[PDB]
């Protein structure tokens, strides 16, 4: 029986949500902090 | 094709307005004796924001 063929892509089912929850990262906040620091420095940082 | 070149034309006049706004914003500066825009070039970044 070869009809039921499953590739590497597969349904994590409920656990899909789990990884969807895991995918959340703190890169957004770290980028925000970098932007804030670089601007408050832009008072002295013009174009470098 | 004609739509393409005409849309190129509107975007060309748009960048024309960009440069016109640049010159118009720097002109009131025109290197004033005061030489200070702490709230305009530091913020609006119109032209040559390297200086001020």
UniProtKB/TrEMBL annotation, chain A:
Q: Where in the cell?
A: Host Golgi apparatus, Host trans-Golgi network; Host cell membrane; Host cytoplasm; Host endoplasmic reticulum
Q: Which residues cross the membrane?
A: 22-45
Q: What is the annotated role of this protein in its UniProt record? A: Acts as a viroporin that participates in virus glycoprotein processing and transport to the plasma membrane, cell permeabilization and budding of viral particles. Disrupts the calcium homeostasis of the cell, probably at the endoplasmic reticulum level. This leads to cytoplasmic calcium elevation. Because of its lipophilic properties, the 6K protein is postulated to influence the selection of lipids that interact with the transmembrane domains of the glycoproteins, which, in turn, affects the deformability of the bilayer required for the extreme curvature that occurs as budding proceeds.
Its subunit composition reads: Interacts with spike glycoprotein E1. Processing of the precursor of protein E3/E2 into E2 and E3 results in a heterodimer of the spike glycoproteins E2 and E1. Spike at virion surface are constituted of a trimer of E2-E1 heterodimers. Interacts with 6K protein. Interacts with host MXRA8; this interaction mediates virus entry. The interaction involves 2 adjacent E2-E1 heterodimers.
Q: Which protein are we looking at?
A: Structural polyprotein
Whichever gene encodes this chain, its name is: SP
Full-sequence portion shown in this chain = 1201 to 1248 of 1248
